[PDB]
């Protein structure tokens, strides 16, 4: 089997991407944030505290003939940005882009933090990291990808995020029309539960490539590119008037600037992030200070290849017995 679904930016900045997902019988379609940095499929629901729902579409398990309470199971998750959610668990039929999994754990939110309530465009998350990070207790649950894997034509999914445009998540096949040149594959460590890999270095604009190992995670559910302070300082030093603002919480730059590109290494290959991808717009409406898309990972304890980096590539998440990542230009 295969599945293919379009993923759409939630706003004009590509702050996140939503993908329609069918849950239950008859289908209830929710728009979920596909997150290769976490391993829970959780939804706004009929169980979510009413004051914490503001415009989201909810899953109502009592309206699904295939929903079953997973008795005794609870979940609770805290994300890198400080947001959180928790609740109980159902099993149900979940389909993505024509690919169906029966008995998928659907984690129903009883509580969500203010950042989820305040974002009406995201109805929940669909985690695509390794199932070792799944938070369900006392019986850990499998991701949608892990449940689908054995049925797929090839044990892979791919992320093709758009810049200010829709893109695609594919399951079980590699669309050879969706990228240019060849896919370069690179080793993955699953020791922390992430799609963790080592970039071979970077360049700023037309500058010379610096060969240096940068361990980090491929994370569709993080907006920005978070890299070591040395690398980030080298990038923003090429932008007149850029500075790190403690008051704003990262690097800002004059909105009048033209940003340089950023290149990252994948083995001997190179992925170029155009400068425009690194502009996240005014810090507040009408401001001439703009937020940078490349930020320091200092204090996060990990480097994150988030959407800024991944949207510049066609990315293969290869779930073979020894997982690997692939990157192609497009
Ligand atoms: O902020 C949410 C991030 C999206 N993926 C999971 C999460 C993260 C990244 C590194 S540790 C936790
Ligand atoms: O802050 C909670 C959500 C509101 N908008 C995006 C954000 C999120 C956190 C992890 S994935 C998406």
Swiss-Prot record:
Molecular function (Gene Ontology), one example: aspartic-type endopeptidase activity
Keyword terms: Aspartyl protease, Disulfide bond, Hydrolase, Protease, Signal, Zymogen
Gene Ontology biological process terms, A to Z: proteolysis
Catalytic residues, chain numbering: 35, 199
Enzyme class, spelled out: hydrolase
Family: Belongs to the peptidase A1 family.
Protein name, UniProt field: Endothiapepsin
Organism listed in the record: Cryphonectria parasitica
Gene it is expressed from: EAPA
Residues of the full protein shown: 90 to 419 of 419
